[PDB]
Every structure is written in C-alpha cells, then in structure tokens.
Amino acid sequence: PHMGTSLFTDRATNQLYVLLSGQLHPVYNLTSARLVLGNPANPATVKSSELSKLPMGQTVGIPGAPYATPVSAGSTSIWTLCDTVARADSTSPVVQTAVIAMPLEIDASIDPLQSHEAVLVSYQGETWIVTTKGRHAIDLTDRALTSSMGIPVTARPTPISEGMFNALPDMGPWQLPPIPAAGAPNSLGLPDDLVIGSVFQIHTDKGPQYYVVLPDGIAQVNATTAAALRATQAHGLVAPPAMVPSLVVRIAERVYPSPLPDEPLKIVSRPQDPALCWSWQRSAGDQSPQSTVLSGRHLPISPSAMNMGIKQIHGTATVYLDGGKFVALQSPDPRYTESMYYIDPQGVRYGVPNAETAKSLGLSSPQNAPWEIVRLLVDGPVLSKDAALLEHDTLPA
C-alpha cells in the first residue's frame, strides 16, 4: 500500500529521491518528481541511513526543468513588451526589447500615447505609423498623401523590433477611407456642386459641423478630416458650402471611419522618447483584455526594478518579473490553439501539455496572457511525465 511518502530529501545534502515501485531514484528537481508521481508532493526529510534501507536506482527527471514551479500571488494578469531605441538619430540605431510581467509605474515620462500622438517606425524597409490602436501602413515617398494625413517631412522613422511589429495590431493603411463613385452626382437631393466625396458644413451652437457626401448618405467628419479630404480633392469648391439644416436633417446619416484625430497630429521624437511599449492586461472576471501603446523616456517600472532584469543567453528580450507565472494562451497556429506555459522567475517558458499535468505540478487557474509577448520568452523543455520518467547516467548537482 502507499504509505504517504514517495518523495524524500537527504537531511545532509538536500538531494531529492523519489520512490517508484519500491525503488528510490535520484531526481533532478521537485518539478520532475511531481511529474512522475502525479501529485505536487512535498519532500520528507530523512537521514541517509534511512534512504540506504531501500534499493536505489538511476537518476530520473528533466534536468532542464525549473527546480519547482512557484507562482507570484498575482492580482491581475499584466504583460508588457517594450522597444528601446539607442542612438535613434544616428546612422546606426539599435533596438533593444524588454518583456515585463509585473505591475507598471506609469508617469508623465512614460505613459500611454494620447489620441493625437503617433510614432513613425520602420520595419523591413517599410514605414508604419503607431497610434494608441496599433500600427498603420504608410508610404512616405507619397509626399501628398503623407502631408494630407498629418505627417511632416521632418518626421524620421526609427526601427521597431520583430516582436513589437508582431505585438502591434495592423489596423490598416494610414489613409482616408476610399469613397466609391467620388466625383459623381449625389443621390441625396443636395446641390449639384456637392458631388460624392465633397465636403460641406452646417452652422451649429458649437460652430461648424463638417460633412462628407457619400453614395448612401452624409457622414460627420472632424475639421482635420475635412481638410484632408479637400487637400486631396476639393471637387472645385473654394470652401465647404454652408448648408441649411432643413436640407440636411432629411438625409440618411452614415459613418465615415477616418483615422485622423480631432487635434493636429503630434509625432513623438524618438531621441526624446526612446521607449515604445505595448501593454496588455486582464483581470479575473473580465470578458476581454485591455491593451494600450506606451511612449516615453524609459521602461515603465521603478528605477529599482530596472536592474532586476534578466536576459537569457538565447533570448531576444531582457525579462522583468515579480515571480513565476502560470499562463493560458490562445493563438491561431494556424488553427485556434489553446496552450499553457509555466514561466519561471528567470523568464523561461515551459509547456504544460494538459490539465492533468498541471494538477501534478500543483498548478491551477492559469492566467490568460498574450501569446505575442509570452512566446518571445526562451522555450525550455515541455513538462511531461513521459520526459520525467527518463533515466540518466549522471546524478543531480
């Protein structure tokens, strides 16, 4: 019968020994011992003379596994990816990347982009504009489009890392939404001058409200969008004609999804603000995560935290965390795939193949996390019972 203790530690050496079918085996770590036992056993301390009372076998386990699988007390799952560009204005700008899995300290020196703020970046020979929503493709050699869309010739793109490029959602071209049948007569009963794609205005209590004429109705646009439309094609109008509300209220209203913000676009200076981050967060009970783009002078963590960073030899990012993590990912690989990883305090991810294995390790309720950030971590060996059952020549250290 099972006698309650299948895991032991030599009182003198603190070495681990696991009991398998009446025989002791040295085992590399607690993680491996629990994998083979099928439950998160805690070692019983005994003298070597006690261990010598059982037959001893070869070393078992996963030597590359973390010693154990502790997890930070964690209120909320928070994951942040940060690009820092060194010598942004030089002929040799360099991007460094950090993964932050811990609460942030946000201030005026490093905070979310505001709605009118944007960063011009380069990736693989192409340029993208980064806003609070993600990245938008733009070709800067198209001087007129670029200018109309609020981007000055004084703007210099700076490189983003591959990880940041993957993390930032492609929200579509930085352009005015194309207007079908632009230039053609309106079908809305408006004056002949107001062709499809033209801009008019009506006077309100808050002053002028601008509209664009669409094939299926009229849509409100802000002043910036109105100017951008007219800068591209004014349709022969010196200014947006003033219309009477009696004429306009009768027409179907539509939505024109211009990406241009109300205020003049402010292009952040990378030398001033070398840090660009994508921060992702989700609390237990939440139906959706919330994500935002940060821009500032350094990482959004305390100065004390700025040197608890760890970079793996074969990792791309320096990792900052407040303890271990147990996370659940969902990704199209290319089919919708749910996966689980344990992340050790060193910033290595280890696959947890199924719920049964998680239970063996004493891991429960994995936090939802973004694969875009988590899979940037170095991938260690999968934590499986099959792997842990393997015998080895050499004793644990």
Nearest-approach distance from CB 315 to Ca ion, in angstroms: 26
Q: Of 116 and 156, which CB lies nearer to Ca ion in the complex structure?
A: 116
Q: Residue 6 and residue 20: Cα distance in Å, rounded? A: 7
The residue whose Cβ lies closest to Ca ion is: 109
Q: Of 111 and 322, which CB lies nearer to Ca ion in the complex structure?
A: 111
Helix (H, G, I), strand (E, B) or coil at 20: strand
Nearest-approach distance from CB 190 to Ca ion, in angstroms: 42
Q: Of 231 and 308, which CB lies nearer to Ca ion in the complex structure?
A: 308
Residue burial 218-255, b: 16+ Cβ < 10 Å; e: rest: bbebebbbbbbbbeebebeeeebeebeeeebeebeeee
Q: Of 208 and 264, which CB lies nearer to Ca ion in the complex structure?
A: 264
Q: Of 108 and 313, which CB lies nearer to Ca ion in the complex structure?
A: 108
Which is nearest to 347 in space by CA: 321, 316, 365? 321
Nearest-approach distance from CB 171 to Ca ion, in angstroms: 20
Read off the amino acid at residue 206: K
Choose the stretch contacting Ca ion; rule: CB under 5 A; options: 103-111, 179-187, 201-209, 340-348.
103-111
x/- mask, Ca ion, residues 319-358, rule CB under 5 A, reads: ----------------------------------------
Nearest-approach distance from CB 111 to Ca ion, in angstroms: 5
What are the distances in angstroms from CA 301 to CA 25, 103, 379?
44, 8, 25
Q: Of 120 and 343, which CB lies nearer to Ca ion in the complex structure?
A: 120
- Kindly determine how many residues on this chain lie close enough to bind Ca ion according to the rule CB under 5 A: 3
Q: Of 222 and 292, which CB lies nearer to Ca ion in the complex structure?
A: 292
Residues of span 204-243 touching Ca ion by CB under 5 A? none
Residue from the set 15, 51, 68, 111 that interacts with Ca ion by CB under 5 A: 111
Question: CB count, 10 Å around CB of 332?
Answer: 8
Helices in 22-116 by DSSP H: which ranges? Answer: 30-37, 48-51
Helices in the chain by DSSP H: which ranges? Answer: 30-37, 48-51, 143-148, 162-167, 223-232, 245-248, 355-361, 371-374, 385-388
Q: Give the 3-state secondary structure of 264-295.
A: CCEECCCCCCCEEEEEEEECCCCCCCEEEEEE
Q: Of 65 and 293, which CB lies nearer to Ca ion in the complex structure?
A: 293
* CB-based contact 60:32 (threshold 8 Å): yes
x/- mask, Ca ion, residues 29-58, rule CB under 5 A, reads: ------------------------------
Nearest-approach distance from CB 268 to Ca ion, in angstroms: 8
Instruction: Dig out the tokens for 25 from the structure.
Output: 């085996």
In this structure, the dihedral spanned by the alpha carbons of residues 134, 136, 141 and 146, taken in order and rounded to 10 degrees, is -90
Could you tell me the maximum CA-CA distance found in the chain, to the nearest angstrom? 102
Instruction: Dig out the tokens for 276 from the structure.
Output: 């660009």
x/- mask, Ca ion, residues 147-186, rule CB under 5 A, reads: ----------------------------------------
- E strand intervals along 87-142: 94-101, 110-112, 117-123, 126-131, 134-138
Nearest-approach distance from CB 161 to Ca ion, in angstroms: 21
Residue burial 42-51, b: 16+ Cβ < 10 Å; e: rest: ebeeeeeeeb
Nearest-approach distance from CB 297 to Ca ion, in angstroms: 5
Residue from the set 42, 52, 90, 109 that interacts with Ca ion by CB under 5 A: 109
Q: Of 201 and 295, which CB lies nearer to Ca ion in the complex structure?
A: 295
302 lies in the binding site for Ca ion (CB under 5 A): no
Q: Of 10 and 111, which CB lies nearer to Ca ion in the complex structure?
A: 111
Nearest-approach distance from CB 3 to Ca ion, in angstroms: 59
Nearest-approach distance from CB 365 to Ca ion, in angstroms: 35
Residues of span 262-301 touching Ca ion by CB under 5 A? 297
Choose the stretch contacting Ca ion; rule: CB under 5 A; options: 94-102, 108-116, 154-162, 204-212.
108-116
The contact set with Ca ion (CB under 5 A) reads 109, 111, 297
